[model samples]
Target chain A: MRCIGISNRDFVEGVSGGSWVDIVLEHGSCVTTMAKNKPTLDFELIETEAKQPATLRKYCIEAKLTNTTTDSRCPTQGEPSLNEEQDKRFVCKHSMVDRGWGNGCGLFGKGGIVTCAMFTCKKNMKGKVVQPENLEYTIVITPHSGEEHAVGNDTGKHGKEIKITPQSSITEAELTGYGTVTMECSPRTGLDFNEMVLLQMENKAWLVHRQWFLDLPLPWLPGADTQGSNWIQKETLVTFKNPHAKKQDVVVLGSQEGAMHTALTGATEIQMSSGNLLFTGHLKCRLRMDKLQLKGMSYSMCTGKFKVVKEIAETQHGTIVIRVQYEGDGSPCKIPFEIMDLEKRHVLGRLITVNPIVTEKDSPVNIEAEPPFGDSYIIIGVEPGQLKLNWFKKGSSIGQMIETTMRGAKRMAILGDTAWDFGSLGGVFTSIGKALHQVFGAIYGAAFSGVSWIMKILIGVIITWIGMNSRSTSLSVSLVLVGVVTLYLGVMVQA
Target chain B: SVALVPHVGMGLETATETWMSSEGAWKHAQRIETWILRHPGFTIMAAILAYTIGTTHFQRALIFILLTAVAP
Candidate 1:
């Protein structure tokens, strides 16, 4: 319990660091180095959950070089990569994310079993790192609830790709030039539909076979299929950028009945990788030129037929993977290839292009509060029936404040009954149903009276063990006692 | 897409009460430890089980079986 604390993470608030490529964490961390030397940082683990802080320490370190190796100048920082000609020790700048959680992230049998986060940017920059002043760092902690958690169900395209880890920034020495890490998160999800646009044709030969077995129409039974909220195709003519850029005549075919997927963005081919481009993910969508009102549009429109080909390319770090099968809705269900740079990391590929299925954080910003709520009223982002703020937020500052002001707005909460359900440990029946079944099998529910089905013989063995093993006797006995009583109300209903 | 509505349906009260709801019961049995906490009343609940089943083996088992059989 002492080891497991609030969110498996530790932050050296007030300090940051980042390398241009291999790792980028310099921004929110105090320097753990001494002038181009091995940064041997020893952190004193001060806090471990709510228990009395253990005298012993729990610590880990991550180190890296953040500079340019070319022309002795870092393009972003313009700093000299002093460790030049010595050997491009890019990997030297990296350290154990969590020493015991060896080899990979979230490895259960390995050290990842016991988690602790001293997180840093996973990207490394090229160059020699030479900052003018020593970095400053201070230890910080976040706590947790010793209960299972569920924020919500899986809703696609919900979470953000870009996440800025929060920390209490610290700086002891004088200020030097600053560094920055810029990257965007991919917002595509299982539900997101990539828009496609192609010039509509008047001939019936343009009627491509629709994809997905389920969505395939049966000419026999007209409405045998379930009701659908399918989209009414719409099109708009737009000019192309760099129209002469060496375009690859590639085909983005759907897995369903050979339907075309990428015609919607008006793209007939995935351009060579480089610069900013989108990616083609799990589902491919093509925009049909329903009825072009190109009356006032400026871009030149041309009627052309597309040929099928296996060749695809994207000028990014990810690999190209083409998905052969598709969903019944005529959407491409898999990407062709994914681009993964070194470090086993997948970098962003072509933006909405022929890249294979690109399979895919809460850092709250602190806001400065000024005045208290209006004289008689207060506003709080509370779920409906969240009286627990008055009761739940034990030892929490905001919780206490909720007690003081919740009276001003008693029935006021955000998610209405959902909040009430959450506040009441979900539904009473759900908890009751859970408890009754948990303690006793359904055999008791339909019965008139209850005399549990478990034998006394088993309970006696436990009592005997608790007595024999004198260590943790009371605690062990207590656990056994709960087990015994739990059985009394119900039997060990095994599978 | 296949129609979301069922083409046919059937159910049983007795089977559902024991067989179907038992699934929920089984989950509760598996999860109850981490579900209900053990504190303050731990000693008391232990007393209930210890006292009733204290030395009664077949004596309690017989009644349990009989009840499951015909006690309705």
Candidate 2:
């Protein structure tokens, strides 16, 4: 669940290092900021210049799948309308991401579990859709009629206006397994995921068109018209029993390399401790909830596969960290992307990705074409006592686990303490705004240039028409009379 | 796309945070009006060009529409 969507070219640029700004306890219970044994922890930070030929394999950040079980029906609940239900099917037919399906159904489908996976769509690829052999997760939706159906476009047949839920969890329970999506291909177009966000792997990339929202589970129990913002909680609060508070609870900042801001006041770090026999502390801070509506915006997708590898490493301070790397070692694929605003009824931007094509690798082959590795200063946080760390290959089945740590802790206070300020849905949206700004600038330049071209072409078309018609003074005079009247009409229209 | 014209016809607008605000439109109109007044020579040149190119297309299109007997 990385916030940024790195394109293929950026992936080719290799890994670059940046300073670690902050670390937040995205989850966990009431705990106060405890004193550190050491002011700083020694972790290896390598320069990108020294690491040549060894390219980035994958880039990923720690993410959790927030449990999204809710009783509120999607779109139209309770007494559903015929037209709305019909429109839902139509929307499902051309569903870009999660818009048309049942609320949270997209997560249950394939979007949530397949956090990141990419495959190469060869130039002149034959298939319209190609599933990677490595991706092996099943989504089974059971209707109230007591029958199971595989995830498909035919939503009407799957269930008849009943609450949709996954029969069994396909991915791992707590996807502690570190990772990182599907893409479609065309013969002429080659490779592209329609209307999707690109997740760059080393050579491959993941297409994220669906399941981008953090759907926090609602405290739903039938009986109230659920508002759009209702499902999104502004505050994450949990009240339960935690007997492990007998000792000084420990919080671990998980990362392989990079330093955490020790003296910085605003920098995020986990801080929560209980001194009383019955623990009581503000476990969570203002929970930021946001809903992104792409109603009038048309989005396009780029295609590729992603492969992320994570290895466990310990810092001098005994904090467990996961070191993940990506390598772009294989041939290239063509990707297509388009953007436009419906309100403006104009194209915002368009892109076509073309890279060097090479033969597929039989094994994990290494190349010396491009190389560099960047270090990450950012890291995820985990309670050493409560969270038992283990190594697991982040595959398709092991997507981001939205650990419900807050669900069990009472009077617990664990605030966001990382670069991604936990309380700000603002943080994520602001990052998205930056991406949009980049695209908007590109489109604006294109539009400005196009204005001149279109005007020139319009004038040329008129001249060409007049030149092709006739050749005489009388004919020209007659044309002038009509032109005068036409000009007046245009003036009138302009007025 | 058509919204691009006023900006170009007068002058390009800056992308401040307020560009998307409700009052930004009126402020832009004022900027365009003031810009036209400030750069009369450029404004005249732009207006003549607009009339020539724009009217030529419009006139040609209307006649063609008449020839094809298409309704406005």
Candidate 3:
């Protein structure tokens, strides 16, 4: 007979503790209720009838262990072995349980004591056997409800259970299997609940994809900066002041595409490479010609094309002063004019008008009321037959005036027709004289019926003598006299 | 013969008129003064002389009558 002594009796004391009978009672009740409940009690009854089931929840625990004694082999005879039929013992020294006491049942219910069973040998093993110097124990609990056992007939109703098997040592393969088993055991109990949550997640993903494709920046996504990449790095400030000392005036016209800059002097293409300068006051252009004066001019003609390069800042209230020069040898000339604005830079108005009346401050033909009332200057020779007048007023149609001037000029041209005809009248007189001579000769031949032969002979002889003698003198004069006499003879016979 | 006289006489009259106008005036006193003023006397005199001599020789030959009388 072999004698075995157990040194750590605390293991036995811990395992056989106060709530052991309570654990057994609860286990027996669950098994009995599951086995007894038949068609009368279903899964519905378990949820509405009994409490929920307990599942295995895994937690990682790390520990450092040391060997207390150094020995090749000691007390190998006292070690517990599986071969010792009904003698296998496991000492549960530390049982870490959840903070809650078994669903508030005060430690007597399921999940109250999570047993960490540590199997230790009473003595160190040697010779043919190797014993672990330091050992660790992990306990996995799988729970099942009475309701699940009641529906055992169904394929999915196999209640979760943990199988405890005896092995020499825990291998890496075994540990991996244990982790997988733990994950399955902790699956969410509500089947429909998981699917509902997943559907919502998929919907959110689709919405994000749609917004990205549309290039729409959703609040959830990052926002782009307001400033574009090509924004100028340097900062600049421009100031425009009222015109003092008759400062040079300029107009800037902007449209949807771009803006054009020009000066009051009718300079359309302004070179911006130069430094910035300020211009002041409201730019006003006025055409003050009360009446177009075209005297001693056979034709007052206005014909040319002009463009509105830059629109005024305030087109509604302002006007463009077009200085027109009537340059051709003709009496009066007309040009086209257009006005526009900087804001809504489009041609506001158009006009075709006669040569502009410019006001001269120091000249004899000072029509100061026509334009440039005060010290405002005018630009001449901007283009052929184009002049720039300062201070043009709004609402006046230069085009309308030009059309009127054109009609008047045409009228003047017609009036000069009388003078032209007089110069050509002399040629008409010469033509009339030749026509009368031909008529007189035709009448004399048709009038004379007959004449005697002898008288005709005598007349012919005398006519021949006269013709021969007068051949040295003017032949045309002689022929005229002969024609007159022949006609007189024919008239005498008719009488 | 009668047709030939008028024709020949007319030709002689035309020749005489041409010679008088072109050359006979050169021998007259008044014409000489006018000729001197209008043209140098040398040039006028040479032209008149050539016309007179040429006309006289042509009339003496009487080529018109001879040609007309022998016509077919």
Residue B26's lDDT in candidate 3: 26
Each candidate: chain B TM-score: 0.25, 0.40, 0.21
Better of 2 and 3 by TM-score: 2
Span of 10 residues, lowest total lDDT, candidate 2 chain B: B10-19
TM-score of chain A of 1: 0.11
Query: Candidate 3's residue-wise lDDT over A1-495, tens digit each?
Result: 000011100000111211111010001011111111111100110110111211111111111112211111112222222321222221112122222332342433122121111121111100011111211112222112111122123234233222211222321112211122111110111111111110011011110111112221111111232221111110110112224321121211111111100000011111111211101101101111111122213323344423323322222112222222233333333223333342243444322122232222111111111221122333333246354434445334575356545433322121121211111123455335434533553354223323422232334434544554555667555554444354333222210
TM-score of each: 0.15, 0.14, 0.10
Worst 10 residues of 3 chain A by lDDT: A1-10
Worst 10 residues of 2 chain A by lDDT: A42-51
| Per-candidate total of colliding backbone pairs | 79, 53, 24
The DockQ score of candidate 2 comes to 0.02
Give the lowest summed-lDDT range of ten residues in model 1 chain A: A230-239
Highest TM-score against the true fold, candidate = 1
Could you tell me how far off, in angstroms, the CA of residue B51 lies in candidate 2 after the best superposition? 0.5
Distance from true location, Cα of A401 in model 3, Å? 26
| Model 1: share of real contacts kept | 0.00
- Report lDDT (Cα) of residue A78, candidate 2: 31
Question: Which ranges of candidate 1 are over 4 A from the true structure?
Answer: A1-481, A484-495, B1-72
